[PDB]
From a paper:
To understand better how the Ulster HN C-terminal extension down-regulates HN activities and may reduce virus pathogenicity, we determined the crystal structure of the NDV Ulster HN “head” or “NA” domain precursor. The purified NA domain protein crystallized in space group P3121 and diffracted X-rays to 3.5 Å resolution. Four copies of the NA domains are located in the crystallographic asymmetric unit, arranged as an apparent dimer-of-dimers, reminiscent of other HN structures. The C-terminal extension wraps around the external surfaces of the HN dimer-of-dimers. The extra C-terminal residues adopt a mostly extended conformation beginning near the bottom of the β-propeller structure, traversing the NA dimer interface, rising above the NA domain and inserting C-terminal residues in the HN catalytic site. The Ulster HN C-terminal extension inactivates the NA domain catalytic site through three potential mechanisms. First, the extreme C-terminal residues occupy the active site, forming specific interactions with residues involved in sialic acid binding. Second, an active site variable loop (the D198 loop) shifts into an inactive conformation, further inhibiting NA binding and catalytic activities. In the Ulster HN structure, we observe that residues E584-K587 in the C-terminal extension directly engage the second sialic acid binding site, indicating that this would be sterically blocked in HN0. The C-termini are stabilized by an interchain disulfide bond formed by C596 and mutagenesis of this residue releases the inhibition of neuraminidase and hemadsorption activities.
Author numbering:
A (entry chain D), B (entry chain C), C (entry chain A), D (entry chain B): 124 to 571, 578 to 615
The structure:
Amino acid sequence: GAPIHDPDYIGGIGKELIVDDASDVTSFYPSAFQEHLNFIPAPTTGSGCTRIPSFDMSATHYCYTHNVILSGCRDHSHSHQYLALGVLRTSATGRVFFSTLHSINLDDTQNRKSCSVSATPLGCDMLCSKVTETEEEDYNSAVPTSMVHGRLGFDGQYHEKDLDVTTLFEDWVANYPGVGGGSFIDNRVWFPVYGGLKPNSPSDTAQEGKYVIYKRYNDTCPDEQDYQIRMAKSSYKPGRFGGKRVQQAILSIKVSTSLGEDPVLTVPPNTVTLMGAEGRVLTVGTSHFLYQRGSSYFSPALLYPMTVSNKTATLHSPYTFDAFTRPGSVPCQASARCPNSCVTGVYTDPYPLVFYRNHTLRGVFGTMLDDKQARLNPVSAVFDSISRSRITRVSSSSTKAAYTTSTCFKVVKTNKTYCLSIAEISNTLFGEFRIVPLLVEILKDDGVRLSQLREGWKDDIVSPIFCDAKNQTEYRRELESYAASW
Amino acid sequence: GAPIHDPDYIGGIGKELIVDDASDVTSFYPSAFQEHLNFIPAPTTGSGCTRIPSFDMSATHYCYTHNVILSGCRDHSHSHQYLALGVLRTSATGRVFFSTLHSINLDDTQNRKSCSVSATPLGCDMLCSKVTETEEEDYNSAVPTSMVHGRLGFDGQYHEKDLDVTTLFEDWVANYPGVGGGSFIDNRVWFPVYGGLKPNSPSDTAQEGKYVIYKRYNDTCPDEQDYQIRMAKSSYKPGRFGGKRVQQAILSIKVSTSLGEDPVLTVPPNTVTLMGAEGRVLTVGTSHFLYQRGSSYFSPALLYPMTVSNKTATLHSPYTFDAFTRPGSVPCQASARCPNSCVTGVYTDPYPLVFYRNHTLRGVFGTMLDDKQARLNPVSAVFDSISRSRITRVSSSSTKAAYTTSTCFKVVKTNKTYCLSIAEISNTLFGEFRIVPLLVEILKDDGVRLSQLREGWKDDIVSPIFCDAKNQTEYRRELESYAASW
Amino acid sequence: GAPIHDPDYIGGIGKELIVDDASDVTSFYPSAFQEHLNFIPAPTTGSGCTRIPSFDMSATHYCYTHNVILSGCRDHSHSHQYLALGVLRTSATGRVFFSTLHSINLDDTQNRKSCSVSATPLGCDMLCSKVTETEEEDYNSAVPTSMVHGRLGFDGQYHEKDLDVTTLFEDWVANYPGVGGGSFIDNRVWFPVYGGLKPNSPSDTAQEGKYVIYKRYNDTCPDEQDYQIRMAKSSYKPGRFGGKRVQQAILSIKVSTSLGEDPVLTVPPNTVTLMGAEGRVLTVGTSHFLYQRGSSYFSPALLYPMTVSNKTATLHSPYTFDAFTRPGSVPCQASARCPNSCVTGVYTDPYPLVFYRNHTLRGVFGTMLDDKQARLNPVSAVFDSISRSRITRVSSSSTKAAYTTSTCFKVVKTNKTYCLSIAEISNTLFGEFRIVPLLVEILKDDGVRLSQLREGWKDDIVSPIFCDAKNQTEYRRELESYAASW
Amino acid sequence: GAPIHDPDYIGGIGKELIVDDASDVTSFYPSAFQEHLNFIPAPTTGSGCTRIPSFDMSATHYCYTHNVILSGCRDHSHSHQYLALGVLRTSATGRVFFSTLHSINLDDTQNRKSCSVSATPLGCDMLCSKVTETEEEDYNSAVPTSMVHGRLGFDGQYHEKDLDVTTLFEDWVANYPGVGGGSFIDNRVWFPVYGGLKPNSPSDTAQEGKYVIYKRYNDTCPDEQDYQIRMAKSSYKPGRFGGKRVQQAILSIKVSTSLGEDPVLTVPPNTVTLMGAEGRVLTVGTSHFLYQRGSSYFSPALLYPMTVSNKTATLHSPYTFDAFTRPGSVPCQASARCPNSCVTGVYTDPYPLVFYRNHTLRGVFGTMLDDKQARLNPVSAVFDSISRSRITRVSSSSTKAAYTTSTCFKVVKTNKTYCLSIAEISNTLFGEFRIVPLLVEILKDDGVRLSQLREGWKDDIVSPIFCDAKNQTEYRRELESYAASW
Ligand SMILES: *[C@@H]1O[C@H](CO)[C@@H](O[C@@H]2O[C@H](CO)[C@@H](O)[C@H](O)[C@H]2NC(C)=O)[C@H](O)[C@H]1NC(C)=O
Ligand SMILES: *[C@@H]1O[C@H](CO)[C@@H](O[C@@H]2O[C@H](CO)[C@@H](O)[C@H](O)[C@H]2NC(C)=O)[C@H](O)[C@H]1NC(C)=O
Ligand SMILES: *[C@@H]1O[C@H](CO)[C@@H](O[C@@H]2O[C@H](CO)[C@@H](O)[C@H](O)[C@H]2NC(C)=O)[C@H](O)[C@H]1NC(C)=O
Ligand SMILES: *[C@@H]1O[C@H](CO)[C@@H](O)[C@H](O)[C@H]1NC(C)=O
């Protein structure tokens, strides 16, 4: 009944990709991006933008979707959504390309933002928040954000249902999906979530006093012991929301012919998770991961080994990768070693790649925006706990960068490992944001930087190409203004 | 068996959308660009470009293709092709989109150039040239170009046959399809083709001494009578090709389960056609038309009415639209009123729109490159024999552009006529070129721009935004250089 | 669109040839072999052989094919395939002969083995397995063998679709087409198929306990009931295949403009079929058949009456012909009356010839290899359930032979029933097997051998002619080695 | 209207294939035999043989025919004639293989013997004699042999016209075409013909006293001058014909829509040509040849330079190749250096292969029967004036053989020169003779007989394979008795 995949993929899809205990994680590096076919539509109107891609790689199919903001790129503006389910396919020449069996376009009045999608046996499942108001008004709204549920089936038809926000979220002021891909666990699909908590509610006094700190590396926070505790605490209550607690949430909805059956929220204790934020839930073989965005003071990409028992989820000590960082505010940037209360950053997810014999994780792959402050210079690299492998530049100079979601799959019949980072980059004319399906293969560092590098750089015309701007580097300044987030 | 269309589109597809004798031509007009899902793939590759698009609209379905060069944008260079078939559907809100049902992506060792495609009952029929050598090299090859005739089934599987060139094209040095595709007439499909002839052959001796001169409205050439003839003659033997005679053609193949069954080559007298160049065969109502790109002296768009009998065709003097002009090299430019030997211009196709009570053609639609010299500033307006209506600018400033293909259909249920224009635009990052399906509706001028006019301009970052360059206007020099062509 | 046949043949093909309840079956006999123009190519290489023919006769055309080993005659080795489609034609003198209208010779890199063909409304459909490995290697290969469905269209062109085995054959370790061809029925083509099953697979569990014993006429096995059952049961798991069950299978594809569309795999109960082997799917008048080779304990020829309902055929207790035998290894040879586990014999099909008044089958014709043990002495003859007619020998003495596939038809104009056997015969120089189409007319014994009898024997030089060898009759020993096989 | 060929050959048919004044003639040698698809029919009847192949290759098509005896191999026996025309094609992988485009098999009461065939502009033009009587009975028949003009057209049908022999042949007792085909020149065809002459008739009294002595090589003839002159003369009155003069003659008919129009008989002087016999007419490029069979005392092959003026041909002093010999009766064998009155030999023709800059012949190709006395050991080799290159053996040991006609062509695209030898070889079962399309590629001797030889030999089973015969070499006797001719 399900589309499944092509002959060559089955067996290498959604499983531990690389296990070697003799080799080093950094010995694995990405090749130059490979030519394939685009399943991601391109902007027609030169007015509004399109951003926020979501991807989940099933053993069977794949699910992807993004949001289209009709006019202006502003968060709250009236928006559409394009969801697409598909299947890997290999051409007559045996080249790799993603294929879309069924897509959908929602043009209606109702709004959807931070739609996350996961792959489940029944179809494409996505959890969207319905926004009739803006960010500020919603935190001012004691009524949980109207949330819904939908499934794109292999039949192509789309059926939706509106979950009960009041009951589920009664302790929540605002509720949004973690924007990232979820995954299918024990016959119920799980999505990450984040949001603010009502003052003095059952769930708020629950995380009260709870906090945690994770250091970066060799260099350690120069602040005193009792000083590290304070900043870590108030982080959960940023000024943006005026002393509201943003908690990390995890939603578990059973996958059944009945849409939205037995919704169950699972909140990890704050002695584990940092300030609530958007992210992605991953399952590699028997392993389960919850990816948290760097919205907090901590730059290095985080993967929380997670488990599920009795409809509820457990979170353990997060996997950190130091070379893999993200841009953010002044208090919280790629170089920040201390705790603080701030709002900045961006979504870039590592997808588990390299593993040990005991099956524990060691190093991964990611498409990172390489920079300290503004969101810039997309770069693809393979990571371990400490540093990252040789990289591949999306373009020379620096180019406008945004949310990136990476996924790695294996081709059994060719015995070759592939990774697809779905990325947002400056679209210039046509609305400033065009998401691209980049394709790459992991290689082995053993051999004879052969003097021919197509991964060295790539050509961006938006900075260069007539006038050389002006070289006193208010350009850096004008660039850092050129970067728009949230 | 066939997909047909939505119940909405049936009845308004491929016909005369507007017939009024009491309406002035320029009094209709395009809308601002409408929002729709893009059915056209975007470059993954950060190396080569994506060029030479083609389109046809069947009473049932649509057929489209575009060629992808793997290294650089050069004409001869090795390239994959991408073809697809799709339908016209209406979403839940009644919105207008074009869905691709089945697409094929050609990765093989065969290098296909200038591919013409038509929508046919049995599927998508495509005429392509496989090219072993470069342009000059093949005009040095007394051997006619090698070609193919394929069809993409509704079943998704794509078949191809190599048609016999040595027999059929025998008098030709080189033979190329006309890009934008011919159409389905009388249980056989007809494609546009141009190319070089074997000097003093059967055909070369046929078009010898034959010519025709086409003047411009209200503007007459100051040159002497004999002179004009002397030129116009030499128009068919341009310098680039060395005394050889460049000829126009249309190819008729009988649509059948077998591919390429019974090829018949229709060669018109030059007493009618200008220097052979690329084009399109269009069918609207009972009306057949053949577009010729303006690749020699005559700028105004040319629609040659066409009759069909005995597997061959016959041409009659073209419908001249003096409102519709293309850029070109200095000798033949949007302005030029005299005959001149030259090779320049671009493919911009007029689509028949308004007709009289006697069934003759009145006005047409299209996107034109607005400029005298090079390819720049695409625009979409309505035209009659002389002037042109209020336009819709695809960009403010001026940006690099290319071939554009316009097509107009009617939505019967809502009784709303729409126009699709597929244009190529400088893509900067990702290979300099991208093929966009622009959307436009036909509206009535009668009324009161409201002092809003969002259709006026569209932003472009290519040229401006860090520097503005050097107003010294050597800018226009490099902007002219930013144009890439054949 | 069809080529059909010559008007003299029309009405005699694919029907019941003889109905007399009054005449004795064995009163009908083959003439002496007839002179006709041979449509089956003969070897060029003085190295590899050419073996394994398959033939099916449409009411319009015919379809024949054979594999060719490029070097050596060994099964696994690289093999071309020649497929032809042709027609019955009558010369000026009315002399019957077979004509090839179009042909395709597949020399490519894909290995096609055990190829079956069938005459269908669209052309020549055929079903081949492509083999990467030796049979040995593939019964260990948990993966089912790749198969392809090609068709040669009257247009002369040839197209392939490799059907997707992982899903269709999923319960099979290896899978092969039944050599001798299938027939076109109910707007879908049906093929003979065999292979091994995965232990404890849905199919395997389905056949567990299932078996049948077929007994020889007038000769009954002395072995006690228990024993026979045990032996019989073992027949399905010969030790050559290592205790995997060897299963007979029928394959149906719906013949359509799309090759290999909507396959359905019909696995009969072993409560009926014997051990899996090659075969032929026959259609005679309103009746249908499945020929099964004698590859296990049961010597006589087998036709299974086959009813077709719901794309899945059904089978019934088989017609047997007790004097139509096949050579076999000691446990299972011409004379074998008991059940035993073995793999032997040769493909020689009966073609239903004579019928009763109720349309049931009464007797058949065909070419049998006449000897108890090895492959030797081809003889053509008419058979009934019990014994056989006056015969005709392809040669005096005893010649190495192989598969035979016979087909009988009637020329109504003259009212003369004829029969074609395509036979595998030793070729001496040129590769040891030459596939030849012998031709014969059927006759009523009522009449007067006139003391002429040119049908008695034919001269073979491969045994005699400079020496006569050594009468010690170790000749027999060597002669039995002159036979090669599978 | 002709079929032409596949585009890859054009320009490689009927021209000087090899011109190097630097290379040694014997440095060009044949390949091992090549795998291809056999276009010549294979025997069905196990009684009568199939003999006497003729061939001519025009740049458009080819023409081949052969005779089929019904019972026994005896010349005069009633026999069918097969004629077919075809077109060189290359496969998917570019393999050379011939194809029969059209064929007719003549079963009528007429007998066509010693049939020659020439590919012309209008089709396959063949010339046969219709034989009522035996060879004896005919040369005692004062009346000239009835002959005929057939043609096989592209439309597929075949017409025939009997030319007036009484008027044309008046001076002859008997007349037959030269077997191997002649070729078309200047809007009229030319055939090889030999036969007898009425005593004291104009043609006979002309050739009286005219004779030619051709000396082999460094081995000369010791007999004195008168003894030689006298035998050289006797050479034209062999006993077989009883003092009737055997003459060589060339037949020229006009090639038109009306068969038999304007026949002309050119008879060259005996001061040039040896005793008359079967032969071939070869137009290679700008030159013309005639191959006289070795039917007389001259062992080496013979190519007479042949010029044409006034519809009547003319010959010149012949090209001798001493290496390329033929077997015959005792007085005239491979080794005969002197003149003699005898009748033997066989048709094995040289095909012009290597040339000089002045367009004079240097060496040829051919398949020769290598032996002094009887017809045995087919071998392919490249010859020059004196010696021969490395050779290809159609088999090991000594296999019964017969006429060989051969022609060489080039494949332009791949630029490779091939050669086709059509040759008669012992068939054992199924008729004692089989005509086979033997294929080869010519090679450069430059290189290193690499220690891997498949051309070394080939395997025949008719001498060997049980009993080793008996070694006293009455075997050579029984062998030389296993060869039958004429
Ligand atoms: C699986 O094996 C790996 C390799 O030994 C373990 O990795 C070590 O973990 C310890 C404990 O944290 C560290 O002190 C070492 O630095 C790690 N070594 C390396 C090379 O990474 C890992 O702990 C094991 N996993 C489990 C669950 O036992
Ligand atoms: C169809 O109607 C149109 C519009 O009246 C005709 O076009 C006119 O043709 C006449 C005669 O050649 C010209 O004098 C006018 O200048 C044309 N008018 C325009 C606006 O182009 C056309 O002739 C009619 N078709 C036929 C075949 O009679
Ligand atoms: C079809 O006809 C055949 C021949 O008449 C029938 O076969 C006979 O069946 C009867 C009844 O069992 C037996 O007594 C005879 O021995 C059979 N004859 C032969 C030659 O086998 C057959 O029964 C008929 N089919 C049906 C369904 O009745
Ligand atoms: C097969 O036949 C049965 C009985 O008519 C019918 O119910 C069923 O629908 C058929 N199967 C298919 C797939 O059409």
